Amino acid sequence: MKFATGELYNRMFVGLIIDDEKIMDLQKAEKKLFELETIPGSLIECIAEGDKFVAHARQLAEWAKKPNDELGSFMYSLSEVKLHAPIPKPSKNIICIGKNYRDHAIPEHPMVFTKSPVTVTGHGDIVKSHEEVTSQLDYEGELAVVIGKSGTRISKEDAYDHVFGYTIVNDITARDLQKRHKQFFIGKSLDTTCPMGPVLVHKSSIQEPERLKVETRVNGELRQSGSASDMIFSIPELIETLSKGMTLEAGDIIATGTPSGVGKGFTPPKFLRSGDKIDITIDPIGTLSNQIG
Amino acid sequence: MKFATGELYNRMFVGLIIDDEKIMDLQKAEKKLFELETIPGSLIECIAEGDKFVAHARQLAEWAKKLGSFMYSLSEVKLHAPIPKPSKNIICIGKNYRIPEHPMVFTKSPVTVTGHGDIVKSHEEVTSQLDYEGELAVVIGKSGTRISKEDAYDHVFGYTIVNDITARDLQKRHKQFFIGKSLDTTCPMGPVLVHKSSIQEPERLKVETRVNGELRQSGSASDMIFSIPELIETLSKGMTLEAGDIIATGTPSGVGKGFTPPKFLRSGDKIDITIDPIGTLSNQIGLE
Ligand SMILES: [Mn+2]
Ligand SMILES: [Mn+2]
Known about the structure:
It is classed as hydrolase. The entry lists the keywords fumarylacetoacetate hydrolase, decarboxylase, elongasome, hydrolase. The structure is a homodimer. The first copy, chain A, is an alpha+beta fold. Chain A has 2 domains: about 1-85, no CATH class; about 95-290, Alpha-Beta Complex (Fumarylacetoacetate hydrolase, domain 2). In chain A, about 15% of the residues lie in helices and about 30% in strands. The first copy, chain A, contains 7 helices and 19 strands. The first copy, chain A, has helices spanning about 25-35, 45-50, 50-65, 100-105, 175-180, 185-190, 235-240, and strands spanning about 1-10, 10-15, 20-25, 75, 80-85, 95-100, 110-115, 120, 125, 135-140, 140-145, 165-170, 175, 195-200, 215-220, 220-225, 255, 275-280, 285-290. In chain A, the strands form 3 sheets. In chain A, strands 1, 2, 3, 4, 5, 6, 7, 8, 11, 12, 14 and 17 form a 12-stranded mixed beta sheet that branches. In chain A, a hairpin with a 2-residue loop joins strand 15 and strand 16 (about 220-225). Chain A is globular and about 60 Å long. In chain A, about 55% of the residues are buried. The interface of A and B includes residues 112, 118, 190 and 245 of A. The structure holds manganese (II) ion (2 copies). One manganese (II) ion binds next to loops of chain A.
């Protein structure tokens, strides 16, 4: 159950990855197979429909396995399709956790800040180097959770009820602008500094998110490697705290923090330069790859 | 030129305050006077249309030559926040009155946003250190990046009032201000959005806050450490500002945390923030 926002011949569509060489255009698939048009035009709208959207999508996928002559019109090879961020335009800033792995800091309450929606970009998209502004761009591979069901004062016990699914984020950061403005917003909210994707995997496919593992490579070289079980604050705890006096809405994105291995962490620090390739891998979400322009 | 989001007979509409007891429903006024329907349903969408929307609005207002129908008494209309649902978090400046060399910048979630006359939740189980902050807010009317200070005002639509209500304990607890700044209903905004053509000298704007009638805050925009053009310049240095983006430009001294015994907000407290000629933003703290 891997959802995505794809683009093909100047149409943007909500897709479902089938086997990982094919993407189904859900609106067009619904139209041929069920002669219905109910599936909305964006993944955030779909997320708001909840479990029934996903059930509908499961059924479309199984009906697409049964033979018919018009596959080419709603089933496309991934090679031919540009993947945008699963949610190209969040309705609010991405909620980011700071220092949530033990050796990254090297915290009794979560440190929480945000990235502007203007940061959001997709798999394969160029990240601006922003050579005026900063010479301390840094990578941060993270597990992102997407809220699927609005709520406030959500307890830990039912936190996963409010989760839709998981994606990858690269929380790219200007380290000098962080220090300069004290609060992290400006250094966290440069244009194109939030690669997201390549897909949004529904939680029904990830029964054990504690066993999720994030891995970051820079120009092929492994930099980060952490496990979600090592998080200081678990996903349920973050949801409990975040929602204590605030409403979490369908489509809200929480970046749950980066492990150690960031560029600032090294003596000589390793900041990003033009041409650098960043690949972040979390199975079974896949790999989020971006290049510095 | 005072724009507003009003509610009447269960419908939300983009309005234009006429005298200051009447509000014109722009969509319905367009429909009667020109028999056209082009004006979008929200003020943020209207802002994105730019100068042409404002010109259109001027013309509708003068074409009040004899009303039903599309002209209503303010008495009859609920005023929401000019922009009920921002497309991103409200950009907030930290200490900008009184000594930083660079602006301290953070955000409030859109879920904070509420209107004139709306109840702010006390959030008694989360905090007992709710505090008020009266501020001048500037609304971007034309997107841009690397905006210079010289043409900063070209990217400004207009001005409103914000009350940047803050939980002071949650601020300290989470270091970064997001949590303590983004409790539900803690961003009263309005009562109107005055177009810049009606202000044009925002340096002379004066903010005043009263709590249960008692004057607490009183600052002038000329005393701001970082002026509006400078904030726009630095915010947009590597980042795109979009039409509809709201910048809260900081509060003067007089906040509740500032007093020995500190004065935090409790159930029943009335907060009135006045900036002429935008008017008065009034809210009450709700029950437990
Ligand atoms: Mn991070
Ligand atoms: Mn403030």
